[PDB]
Ligand binder design. Structure first.
Ligand SMILES: CC(C)(C)OC(=O)N[C@H](CCN[C@@H](Cc1ccccc1)C(=O)N[C@@H](CCC(=O)O)C(=O)N[C@@H](Cc1ccccc1)C(N)=O)Cc1ccccc1
Lengths: 99, 99
């Protein structure tokens, strides 16, 4: 649908059998979720943002359902304040910015 | 216009007589620009993101031109890696997310 930005653009996602709330973030190349019990294999990685760098576990080919659209992609899990849905998944649901 | 997210959503902004490139960020409540000389007064503030917290100077009623749309709002200046245009200005140009 069309979401305006007067409030934070939060959506419901279903990942790993669990329901969560996530922020649609055009300024994030990657999708980062707060600590979570994910299954499968992974590899370490570091990401940066406004205040510095954090270490996250990187899981590939993870099924995630965002506002009803299923997509499969990489998800990073670590000590992030909020769950963020980045461009790697946003392109997958054909999300665009319009003005 | 309509901007897809296969690449980072960077735009040209004009602020303080200077031209810069900034990232349209739906996941940022605020607009943060790298170090730059701005006129007018200000007050200290701290902001957080993935990574931690940074200190920025906060200037109000600043004219900024984003892809041709002039808007007046608060701008925060400090040690951010990239220039980020947050929701405080994005609502001003009537920017929406669509999918
Ligand atoms: C700028 C202010 C006003 C402080 O807001 C946020 O940080 N907002 C966060 C959105 C994040 N948007 C961008 C802003 C940005 C962009 C470039 C540079 C610095 C900052 C971001 O950090 N994006 C990260 C998200 C994590 C990720 O994508 O993996 C990113 O794309 N980082 C890249 C680019 C990068 C590399 C090195 C250093 C810094 C950044 C990366 N691959 O690590 C959301 C949030 C909500 C609640 C609490 C805290 C934070």
């Amino acid at each position: 649908p069309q979401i305006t930005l007067w409030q934070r653009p939060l959506v419901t996602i279903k990942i790993g059998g669990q329901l969560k709330e996530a922020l649609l973030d055009t300024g994030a190349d990657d999708t980062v979720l707060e600590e979570m019990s994910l299954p499968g294999r992974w590899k370490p990685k570091m990401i940066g943002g406004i205040g510095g760098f954090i270490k996250v576990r990187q899981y590939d080919q993870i099924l995630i359902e965002i506002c009803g659209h299923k997509v499969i992609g990489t998800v990073l899990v670590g000590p992030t304040p909020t769950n963020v849905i980045g461009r790697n998944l946003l392109t997958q649901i054909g999300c665009t910015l319009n003005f």
